[PDB]
Scaffold this active site. Structure first.
Site, PDB file in Angstrom:
ATOM      1  N   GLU A  63       0.854  -1.180   0.000  1.00 21.73           N
ATOM      2  CA  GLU A  63       0.000   0.000   0.000  1.00 21.73           C
ATOM      3  C   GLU A  63       0.896   1.238   0.000  1.00 21.73           C
ATOM      4  OE1 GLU A  63       0.097   1.631   4.244  1.00 21.73           O
ATOM      5  OE2 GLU A  63      -1.024   2.342   2.495  1.00 21.73           O
TER       6      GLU A  63
ATOM      7  N   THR B 238       2.771  -8.062   4.674  1.00 21.43           N
ATOM      8  CA  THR B 238       3.775  -7.777   3.661  1.00 21.43           C
ATOM      9  C   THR B 238       5.152  -8.155   4.204  1.00 21.43           C
ATOM     10  OG1 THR B 238       2.435  -6.069   2.663  1.00 21.43           O
ATOM     11  CG2 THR B 238       4.785  -5.950   2.209  1.00 21.43           C
ATOM     12  N   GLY B 239       5.428  -7.743   5.447  1.00 21.01           N
ATOM     13  CA  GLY B 239       6.691  -8.020   6.115  1.00 21.01           C
ATOM     14  C   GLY B 239       6.997  -9.516   6.164  1.00 21.01           C
TER      15      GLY B 239
ATOM     16  N   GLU C  89      31.578 -12.652   5.800  1.00 24.10           N
ATOM     17  CA  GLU C  89      32.312 -12.738   7.055  1.00 24.10           C
ATOM     18  C   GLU C  89      31.356 -12.775   8.249  1.00 24.10           C
ATOM     19  OE1 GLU C  89      35.935 -10.560   9.580  1.00 24.10           O
ATOM     20  OE2 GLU C  89      35.708 -10.041   7.451  1.00 24.10           O
TER      21      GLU C  89
HETATM   22  N1  LIG Z   1       9.947  -1.331  15.334  1.00 23.56           N
HETATM   23  C1  LIG Z   1       8.897  -1.091  14.539  1.00 23.56           C
HETATM   24  N2  LIG Z   1       7.929  -1.999  14.442  1.00 23.56           N
HETATM   25  C2  LIG Z   1       6.938  -1.603  13.603  1.00 23.56           C
HETATM   26  C3  LIG Z   1       6.842  -0.431  12.886  1.00 23.56           C
HETATM   27  N3  LIG Z   1       5.667  -0.403  12.140  1.00 23.56           N
HETATM   28  C4  LIG Z   1       5.086  -1.545  12.416  1.00 23.56           C
HETATM   29  N4  LIG Z   1       5.800  -2.320  13.292  1.00 23.56           N
HETATM   30  C5  LIG Z   1       5.458  -3.643  13.799  1.00 23.56           C
HETATM   31  O1  LIG Z   1       5.298  -4.511  12.682  1.00 23.56           O
HETATM   32  C6  LIG Z   1       4.119  -5.329  12.856  1.00 23.56           C
HETATM   33  C7  LIG Z   1       3.088  -4.932  11.827  1.00 23.56           C
HETATM   34  O2  LIG Z   1       3.637  -5.173  10.516  1.00 23.56           O
HETATM   35  P1  LIG Z   1       3.732  -3.935   9.505  1.00 23.56           P
HETATM   36  O3  LIG Z   1       5.150  -3.709   9.121  1.00 23.56           O
HETATM   37  O4  LIG Z   1       2.945  -2.769   9.985  1.00 23.56           O
HETATM   38  O5  LIG Z   1       2.946  -4.598   8.279  1.00 23.56           O
HETATM   39  P2  LIG Z   1       3.174  -4.629   6.696  1.00 23.56           P
HETATM   40  O6  LIG Z   1       4.453  -5.301   6.389  1.00 23.56           O
HETATM   41  O7  LIG Z   1       2.881  -3.286   6.145  1.00 23.56           O
HETATM   42  O8  LIG Z   1       2.011  -5.632   6.262  1.00 23.56           O
HETATM   43  P3  LIG Z   1       0.469  -5.382   5.866  1.00 23.56           P
HETATM   44  O9  LIG Z   1       0.106  -3.984   6.316  1.00 23.56           O
HETATM   45  O10 LIG Z   1      -0.227  -6.483   6.630  1.00 23.56           O
HETATM   46  O11 LIG Z   1       0.411  -5.564   4.368  1.00 23.56           O
HETATM   47  C8  LIG Z   1       3.712  -5.137  14.320  1.00 23.56           C
HETATM   48  O12 LIG Z   1       4.435  -6.039  15.147  1.00 23.56           O
HETATM   49  C9  LIG Z   1       4.145  -3.691  14.579  1.00 23.56           C
HETATM   50  O13 LIG Z   1       4.359  -3.391  15.942  1.00 23.56           O
HETATM   51  C10 LIG Z   1       7.881   0.530  12.991  1.00 23.56           C
HETATM   52  O14 LIG Z   1       7.968   1.628  12.421  1.00 23.56           O
HETATM   53  N5  LIG Z   1       8.890   0.104  13.857  1.00 23.56           N
HETATM   54 MG   LIG Z   2       1.104  -2.223   5.837  1.00 22.81          MG
END
Ligand SMILES: Nc1nc2c(ncn2[C@@H]2O[C@H](COP(=O)(O)OP(=O)(O)OP(=O)(O)O)[C@@H](O)[C@H]2O)c(=O)[nH]1
Ligand SMILES: [Mg+2]
Ligand SMILES: Nc1ncnc2c1ncn2[C@@H]1O[C@H](COP(=O)(O)OP(=O)(O)NP(=O)(O)O)[C@@H](O)[C@H]1O
Ligand SMILES: Nc1nc2c(ncn2[C@@H]2O[C@H](COP(=O)(O)OP(=O)(O)O)[C@@H](O)[C@H]2O)c(=O)[nH]1
Ligand SMILES: [Mg+2]
Ligand SMILES: [Mg+2]
EC number: 3.6.5.-
Lengths: 425, 486, 436
Positions: C71, C145-146, C254
């Site tokens: 997105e 996504t992550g 390494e």
């Molecule tokens: N440290 C940190 N964690 C984050 C951040 N944004 C989201 N999270 C964590 O990441 C998880 C949520 O995944 P996101 O990265 O928001 O999701 P995405 O990869 O955009 O995936 P979708 O929105 O489901 O498509 C939760 O555990 C959040 O607390 C950030 O800026 N920093």
């Molecule tokens: Mg997202």
């Protein structure tokens, strides 16, 4: 995930629908002409979710208005915000449904449905990223429940990738037009169980009980009930209509709220209850109270699978966090342990009109089986004696269809029972 | 206990060239080993078929043994389960050359019926359906989407499904063939034979002794399931993706049913049959009053390691599904007065009565003019009937009196008139309900008070032991509970 | 020298990226427009910071970075923000709709629409490299996504760049910040799908960072901005050697050599010190001895676990700033006499040492005090198994009921993929058990 298409069907649907638009338009600072006259940009950041932009500053609700009788949409048109709706989006018949689900689903309703689908499809084509649909309706009548559920299945067939949400008003003898309401409600529940992603169960039983016992109104009107409905609908949709990152779209809400396909019926809650400033401890307390539920079930009698809480107004998000952790700690048994972290909280800076701070609760509780059990027994009392069967079979329905709906709603109750008892791992 | 069988298909040309060792090892006819020396898992099955297995041999140790009991009125089911390309369509519906278990089952059934004609008369009713994208479609006559409905008596029925009556082996085999061709099967370049839908052939047997010196009925279900498809491993899109999703969800549903049924320690607990049309059809066929056989199809290759492991875990668990088996076994003016009373036509009533219509006529259910008038709120006809000799306490075949019905529907004035003419305030129907129970359930509070005033017994209990008070408590109906408090 | 490409996936990956690249620019004297006055060779260069930055003829220094989200909301902020001119626009890729906290949507349904485009953009970067070492991939476990898209990306990169190294910075979920009940599912699926395609993965427990921000930085309710600044300081320490031509961890390979003896057990615990409020800047600077000892205090770890009751497989100590080599050797020699330490049979008892002489840098918003010297310890300890266990447990609770599973299966996954994923995790816990 941007646009939602709203549909309101039948008398009840159009009544609460109109009120919803009255209330949310005020919150978004939109006048009956469809002109913005607000203060903060926060009101416009996600206006596209509910409103299309027209030539000028004109905001028009993405709303489709359906009924098998004309009367209701004449009263909608001649109401405070009647002029705001797209005239092409009024789909009205002449005959009526006569409180008969069959007429809604199979005959009169079935011959008006394609006209509605045309309007839906038109609204859909002009969407960048359609989230899905929200239908408001009663379960107890003919149009709302019969045609509404026919509409739902047709939309599910046509747009299988989109989220289907309903605001469904469940009938009660305390606010009864007829004794066929159980039949109508059970036939619809059967439809809702298969074809909906999320159903908000608004219970006339509960709305009455609240107006009569808590608000101490000797004889509550529909306006009184509807005041609670509007508040609830406003609160339930805040996360959709204002900036935020939790339950911010229809799909994300569903994934958070619905562990099992069929178990997608939610108990709405609201605090404070007013009739035509709470401390955050009080707000949180009242939310989980039986008296503030919009479904006539005691939450204490069941267990929560998932909960979404929404606080409105200027308050400390820290204080909220402490107070919600409090409730889960003090009352650990009321929350299934096999779904870790099942209570999600959100805060929204803009409160509803006439309140400085408020809370809305959305619970997926196993206590909702009380609602289904109440309807089920009324249905059975009637169906055993075969009262008024001819009304339905006369419209082409099979008796087996009643048996099927009964079986399913009872199975739903039983499915709820399993998870209320599914402690063991 | 449900019977479970494993069919290890022979390695194809694709698996041979790879030269990856075989994970599936057949030791005994009962025993198989999953990942030999690695996990090295011993599995016990009712039968195990190796790579050299013929159709006849599979048939010989699956359906053939049960066909006797089928004829003796015992429900039967064969269902082919397992991953894609494992050979369940091969096993069930065979090739152009080699006939499948379905063919062989039907061929032998009719041979059996022919050999015992002089001792027993047999008739068969058959249907063939497809579960495709959570929709049921008739494979014999091109009927549209069909609805699934359930009674606690007849079980799960497919409304609109055409029943056929073949009388020879050649007739039934023709319907089998017709359906096999009507079945949704998409010819892909990647995959020649992959099932898009679940094929379910059903055979309804009616059997009687020839001299009738008591009919025995049985249902046999033959199911060829489509296998689940990883959208990564396959890479499907469009209509093929949707197909995959629906299939996978049905198999998820099946999975949950198997787990809940197996070693449940909870026979009182819910089974999620309604999660899929497939599991609804299979409701009466999984560990109920049915002799069920699972043919679990597997590849021997390492390439399908996980797929094979998944199949075996579920096959093994299906063995614990327990089953309890059993052999199955007045006047013309009356009609008019009834209809008239129902419809609330005061004038037609008078005229029919003037001509001598039986005021105490009954329909097929034993309902009278008074019952119908009382139900549908026609006060004037109620009075008229009572004034001319209607039995105020008549019961239908279900024990309903006029007062039961007036109370249920909430006709206050009628309830009063009935009582004043000597209605039994405490009449009990077949469900153990009194007028009080019915008025309570339906939340007719004014009627409740009137019933109580006229000596309704607050202590009367239905079949489930519930009084009117109990009902109000179990309903959270405080308005009602308050009045019943004494 | 040899170039490294950074890939940031989902909100977490992207927002961490913002914090990392801001910090990188600050460390190398690069401005928001990519202008670096101190670089005298405008065309290009063989410099150490060129591993992370390419150079345009206009003297513009450009991150070797791809930002990807399904997105646009988050990457739109980059496109409109202070550092918009830092990146070539093609490096910022967005789709229409996200994966709705669903691994399967990220991996299959929505992800497959954009994967080929992403690989093309990556390829564009790889073509500007004379000797690509590999990739640093930033993502959440918990996001759709992550988790889902990263998995897919890692698979495709294993095919398209077989001999290249791949390192992850992974955000492990915490209930304090989480917004999805299904985050345990997403985590396990992505761990299993990614495991064979990743050489070394640095996990950051959101709970740990939250705790540190609250305790050491006196921050009442930490935001992602607060978390990210701290994280970026830890990322910076880890990647310093790549950007300043160090003696330890001079290249990506390494990292594996120095931290990962056994391929599947590739999750080093990071510990960082000192984390001090600016409200305490006036204090006396902590010594090499003091900060080295703070590396063994659990409250300073990036992942919650107990290394004291576990066994080490490897241990690097990365010092930055006003640090004299002899003082380091003193501190390390001393650790033995605090008797905290115990190693596995087949592995050496050595603590590898890296020193860079660049003082830590703090960003404008930072709550963190500027210190003269800091250390990051990277230790491959069996204690980290505890993190997997906690996560596996939450998975088990839900999967026993098949809670939410229909959401994944409805997206073209088989139920079986949950079993496969969970079993690989059981094997991983066994792997940690055995080396003990
Ligand atoms: N440290 C940190 N964690 C984050 C951040 N944004 C989201 N999270 C964590 O990441 C998880 C949520 O995944 P996101 O990265 O928001 O999701 P995405 O990869 O955009 O995936 P979708 O929105 O489901 O498509 C939760 O555990 C959040 O607390 C950030 O800026 N920093
Ligand atoms: Mg997202
Ligand atoms: N027992 C067997 N002997 C020889 N060939 C076999 C056997 N079983 C399967 N095959 C071969 O394998 C191919 C695919 O098997 P098939 O029975 O169509 O799979 P399936 O299990 O029905 N797959 P699917 O419907 O997608 O779940 C067939 O075309 C045969 O050539
Ligand atoms: N809360 C509420 N319930 C209503 C309203 N109007 C009708 N109902 C309920 O809706 C049911 C009847 O359905 P209705 O919508 O009137 O019929 P339809 O127009 O054929 O759908 C009964 O249970 C009524 O109590 C209203 O304005 N508010
Ligand atoms: Mg097949
Ligand atoms: Mg240069």
């Amino acid at each position: 995930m941007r646009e939602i298409v709203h549909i309101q069907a039948g008398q009840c649907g159009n009544q609460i629908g109109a009120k919803f638009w009255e209330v949310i338009s005020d919150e978004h600072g939109i006048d009956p002409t469809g002109s913005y006259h607000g203060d903060s940009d926060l009101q416009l950041e996600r206006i596209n979710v509910y409103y299309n932009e027209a030539a000028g500053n004109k905001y028009v609700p993405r709303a489709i208005l359906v009924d098998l009788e004309p009367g209701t949409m004449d009263s909608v048109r001649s109401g405070p915000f009647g002029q705001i709706f797209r005239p092409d989006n009024f789909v009205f018949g002449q005959s009526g449904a006569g409180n008969n689900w069959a007429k809604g689903h199979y005959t009169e309703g079935a011959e008006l449905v394609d006209s509605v689908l045309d309007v839906v499809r038109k609204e859909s084509e002009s969407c960048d990223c359609l989230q899905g649909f929200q239908l408001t309706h009663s379960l107890g009548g003919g149009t709302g429940s019969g045609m509404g559920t026919l509409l739902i299945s047709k939309i599910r067939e046509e747009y299988p990738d989109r989220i289907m949400n309903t605001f469904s008003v469940v009938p009660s003898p305390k606010v009864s037009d007829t004794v066929v309401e159980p039949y109508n409600a059970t036939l619809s529940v059967h439809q809702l169980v298969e074809n909906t992603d999320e159903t908000y169960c608004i219970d006339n039983e509960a709305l009455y009980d609240i107006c009569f016992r808590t608000l101490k109104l000797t004889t509550p009107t529909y306006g009184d009930l509807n005041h609670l409905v509007s508040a609830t609908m406003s609160g339930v949709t805040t996360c959709l209509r204002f900036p935020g990152q939790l339950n911010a779209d229809l799909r994300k809400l569903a994934v958070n709220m619905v562990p099992f396909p069929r178990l997608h019926f939610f108990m709405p809650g609201f605090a404070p209850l007013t009739s035509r400033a709470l401390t955050v401890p009080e707000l949180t307390q009242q939310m989980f109270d039986a008296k503030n539920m919009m479904a006539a079930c005691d939450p204490r009698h069941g267990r929560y699978l998932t909960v979404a809480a929404v606080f409105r107004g200027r308050m400390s998000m820290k204080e909220v966090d402490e107070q919600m952790l409090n409730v889960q700690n003090k009352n650990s048994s009321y929350f299934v342990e096999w779904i870790p972290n099942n209570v999600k909280t959100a805060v929204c800076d803009i409160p509803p009109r006439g309140l400085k701070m408020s809370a809305t609760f959305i619970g997926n509780s196993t206590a909702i089986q009380e609602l289904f059990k109440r309807i089920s027994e009324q249905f059975t009392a009637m169906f055993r004696r075969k009262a008024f069967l001819h009304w339905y079979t006369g419209e082409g329905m099979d008796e087996m269809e009643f048996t099927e709906a009964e079986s399913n709603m009872n199975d739903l109750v039983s499915e709820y029972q399993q998870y209320q008892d599914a402690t063991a791992d | 206990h449900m019977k479970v069988v494993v069919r290890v298909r022979p390695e194809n040309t694709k698996e041979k060239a790879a030269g990856f060792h075989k994970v599936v090892h057949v030791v005994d006819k009962h025993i198989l080993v999953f990942d030999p020396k690695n996990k090295d898992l011993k599995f016990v099955f009712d039968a195990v078929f190796d790579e050299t297995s013929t159709q006849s041999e599979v048939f010989e140790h699956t359906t053939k043994p049960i066909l006797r009991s089928f004829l003796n009125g015992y429900n039967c089911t064969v269902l082919a389960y397992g991953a894609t390309g494992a050979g369940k369509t091969h096993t069930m519906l065979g090739s152009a050359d080699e006939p499948g278990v379905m063919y062989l089952t039907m061929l032998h059934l009719y041979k059996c019926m022919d050999e015992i004609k002089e001792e027993k008369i047999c008739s068969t009713a058959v249907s063939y359906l497809e579960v495709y994208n959570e929709q049921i479609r008739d494979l014999l006559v091109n009927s549209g989407p069909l609805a699934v409905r359930e009674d606690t008596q007849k079980g799960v029925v497919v409304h609109g499904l055409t029943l056929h009556q073949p009388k020879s082996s050649e007739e039934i085999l023709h319907l089998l063939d017709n359906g096999n061709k009507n079945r949704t099967q998409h010819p892909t370049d990647m995959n020649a034979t992959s099932s898009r839908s679940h094929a379910v052939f059903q055979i309804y047997l009616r059997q009687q002794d020839k001299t009738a010196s008591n009919v025995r009925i049985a249902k046999m279900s033959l199911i060829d399931l489509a296998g689940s498809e990883r959208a990564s491993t396959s890479g499907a899109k469009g209509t093929r993706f949707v197909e995959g999703t629906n299939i996978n969800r049905s198999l998820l549903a099946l999975g949950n049913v198997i787990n809940a049924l197996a070693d449940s320690k909870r026979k009182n607990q819910h089974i999620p049959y309604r999660n899929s049309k497939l599991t609804r059809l299979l409701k009466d066929s999984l560990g109920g009053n049915c002799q069920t056989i699972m043919i679990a199809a597997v590849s021997p290759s390492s390439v399908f390691y996980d797929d094979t492991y998944n199949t075996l875990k579920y096959a093994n668990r299906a063995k614990d599904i327990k089953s309890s088996l059993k052999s199955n076994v007045g006047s013309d003016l009356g009609k008019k007065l009834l209809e008239a009373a129902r419809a609330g036509q005061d004038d037609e009533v008078r005229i029919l009565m003037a001509n001598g219509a039986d005021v105490n006529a009954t329909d097929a259910s034993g309902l009278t003019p008074l019952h119908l008038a009382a139900t549908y709120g026609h006060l004037e006809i109620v009075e008229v009937l009572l004034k001319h000799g209607a039995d105020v306490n008549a019961i239908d075949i279900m024990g309903s009196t006029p007062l039961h019905l007036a109370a249920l529907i909430g006709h206050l004035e009628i309830v009063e008139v009935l009582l004043k003419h000597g209605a039994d305030v405490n009449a009990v129907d077949t469900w153990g309900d009194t007028p009080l129970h019915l008025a309570a359930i339906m939340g007719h509070l004014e009627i409740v008070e009137v019933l109580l005033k006229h000596g309704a017994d607050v202590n009367a209990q239905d079949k489930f032991g519930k009084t009117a008070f109990d009902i109000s408590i179990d309903n959270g109906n405080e308005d009602l509970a308050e009045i019943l408090q004494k | 020298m040899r170039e490294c490409i950074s890939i940031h996936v989902g909100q977490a990956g992207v927002q961490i990226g913002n914090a990392c690249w801001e910090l990188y620019c600050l460390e190398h004297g690069i401005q928001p427009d990519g202008q670096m006055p101190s670089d005298k060779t405008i065309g290009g260069g063989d410099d150490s910071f060129n591993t992370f930055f390419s150079e345009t003829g206009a003297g513009k220094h450009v991150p070797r970075a791809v930002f990807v989200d399904l997105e646009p909301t988050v990457i739109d902020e980059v496109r409109t923000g202070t550092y918009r001119q830092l990146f070539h626009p093609e490096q910022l890729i967005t789709g229409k709709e996200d994966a709705a906290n669903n691994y399967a949507r990220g991996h299959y349904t929505i992800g497959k629409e954009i994967i080929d485009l992403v690989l093309d953009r990556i390829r564009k970067l790889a073509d500007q490299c004379t000797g690509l070492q590999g990739f640093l991939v930033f993502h959440s476990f918990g996001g759709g996504t992550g988790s889902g898209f990263t998995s897919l990306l890692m698979e495709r990169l294993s095919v398209d760049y077989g001999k290249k190294s791949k390192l992850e910075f992974s955000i492990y979920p915490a209930p304090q910040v989480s917004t999805a009940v299904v985050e345990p599912y997403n985590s396990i699926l992505t761990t299993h799908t990614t495991l064979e395609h990743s050489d070394c993965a640095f996990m950051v427990d959101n709970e740990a960072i939250y705790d540190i921000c609250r305790r050491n930085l006196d921050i009442e309710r930490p935001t992602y901005t607060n978390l990210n600044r701290l994280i970026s300081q830890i990322v910076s320490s880890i990647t310093a050697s790549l950007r300043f031509d160090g003696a330890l961890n001079v290249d990506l390979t390494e990292f594996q050599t120095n931290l990962v003896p056994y391929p599947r057990i590739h999750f080093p615990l990071a510990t960082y010190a000192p984390v001090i409020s600016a409200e305490k800047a006036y204090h006396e600077q902590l010594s090499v001895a003091e900060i080295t000892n703070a590396c063994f205090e659990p409250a300073n770890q990036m992942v919650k676990c107990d290394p004291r009751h576990g066994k080490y497989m490897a241990c690097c100590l990365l010092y930055r700033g006003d640090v004299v080599p002899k003082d380091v050797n003193a501190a390390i020699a001393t650790i033995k006499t605090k008797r905290s330490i115990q190693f596995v049979d087949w592995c050496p008892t050595g603590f590898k040492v890296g020193i860079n002489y660049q003082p830590p840098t703090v960003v404008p918003g930072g709550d963190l005090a500027k210190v003269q010297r800091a250390v990051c310890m990277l230790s491959n300890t069996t204690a980290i198994a505890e993190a997997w266990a906690r996560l596996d447990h939450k998975f088990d609770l839900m999967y026993a009921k098949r809670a939410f599973v229909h959401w994944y299966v409805g997206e073209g996954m088989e139920e079986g993929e949950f079993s496969e994923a969970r079993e690989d995790m059981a094997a991983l816990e066994k792997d940690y058990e055995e080396v003990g």
